Design a protein around this nucleic acid. Sequence first.
RNA 1: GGUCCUAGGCUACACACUGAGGACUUGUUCCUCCCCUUUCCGCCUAGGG
RNA 2: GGUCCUAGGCUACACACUGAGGACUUGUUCCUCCCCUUUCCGCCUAGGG
Lengths: 116, 116, 124, 124
Amino acid sequence: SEEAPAGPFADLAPGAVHMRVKEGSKIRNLMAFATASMAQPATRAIVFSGCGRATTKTVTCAEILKRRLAGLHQVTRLRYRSVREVLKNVPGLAILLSKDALDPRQPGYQPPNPHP
Amino acid sequence: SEEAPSGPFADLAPGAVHMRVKEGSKIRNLMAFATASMAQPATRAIVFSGCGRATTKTVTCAEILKRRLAGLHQVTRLRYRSVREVLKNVPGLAILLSKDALDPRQPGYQPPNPHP
Amino acid sequence: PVEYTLRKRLPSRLPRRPNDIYVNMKTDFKAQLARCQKLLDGGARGQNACSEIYIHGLGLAINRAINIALQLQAGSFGSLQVAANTSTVELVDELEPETDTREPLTRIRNNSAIHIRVFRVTPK
Amino acid sequence: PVEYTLRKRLPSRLPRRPNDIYVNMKTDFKAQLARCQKLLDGGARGQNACSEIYIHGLGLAINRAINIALQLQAGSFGSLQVAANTSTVELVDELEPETDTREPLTRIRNNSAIHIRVFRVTPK
RNA sequence: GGUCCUAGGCUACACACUGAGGACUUGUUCCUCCCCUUUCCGCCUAGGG
RNA sequence: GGUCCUAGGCUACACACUGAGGACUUGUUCCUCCCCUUUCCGCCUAGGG
């Protein structure tokens, strides 16, 4: 199997840690790295990406990180990806979580939940 | 180090699974055994016990199980325990969680947290 | 029994506005697509088209929500735009019958859900 | 900095009734005890005694709440009874300042709390 | 019979939320975990020019 | 100075919430993770018999 279209947030967060989520990936593995990485104050932003059978997990990793770290700014982006292994069009997404404010006008923006 | 003043809820749930919580006991280990044990429908009730440095964990184990299994009926009982090397009194706890209803008049009774 | 049987409780009630569309893994794709398509297009003289709909999908229905949204926009000649939020949804599996007397005994689970605003943009 | 420092936001506000008593790991034991004692005892003529107090303790303060409740009961000649409930409490550690503009950046964790009703029982 | 309109209806989840099981230099790893694609006149009810 | 009263004040957490680090027949395991014990006229502020 090889992926390809048909940084995902180069425009908004050029140096962001990129979490490539695969259907195989143990969540606990991805989250360990993800949380450690965002533990470092110099790490400003993280991206989670996946498609097909890895989309659910992609969103799940994004929601668990938001549960541990309040205040992140979110942008969700929908993409098709082509997979050859007999090639298939497969829906996917990329989620940006940012310690720094993003323009609310950016489509797929979600403000942080207040936690009052 | 040995503890001392059949089970802490022999009166209310005689054959209940007894989770003896020690400081140092890994939560994830205690919870694995506890969740599997209550996964079985014939297992009607479980008890977590601890004192001194294991009290907070005793309560934590009870709260986590209540988060996975809604409907459990709770009774919390406070006791002192004696320990030896130097003999100390330590505050401690035993928590009963029951798939079956308990008399709301039992002191330390907590009705099940509903899901709206 | 030596283990409880899988039995799902309906994910709350869906506070469903008329332009809210829930996506499922039961009905045919093309029907879910067509129904979203007609909400947005209106009649054959664009009568009562919605300016936006929200496509909600949970768990495995996330791909299918995305799919329907991207399909809608792919055939709009750029008049339909897309905006996705995510959220966490608590699910309740029944373990022991709710009687009139008892709280049911239920297992608690989280699933990711997706919420895709699909809205018509017009020149002006 | 390779890591954030370990600053804590105040556990919400304490919707504190007069007969609510929060227990801490800062003030001296004997004072917290003495203060719970005279809330329950009232004056030397028994004037303005509380029928019940609630003793609330979080995290490491759970043992101390238990301790105060049992010490109260131990000296009542069986006129004081205890009743403990537990709960889960969300705590917020500050990571980046709450500025005028933006929501602050915070770490979320849970502590167990205990809630001990200590109440006066009298004959008849 | 033909053709237009109108008002409804058309099931949120893989126990996949720190998933499962296997393998291996532990850990953003590899493998395994049946189908669900792609409407343009969608389908089904009533009712009206 | 003595004695009584009244009103108020007296800091919810071990990042210990699927904790941390070691050890070992993995897992209700062991070991390490400083003190906080226990009032009886408690302490402090103001005011009144």
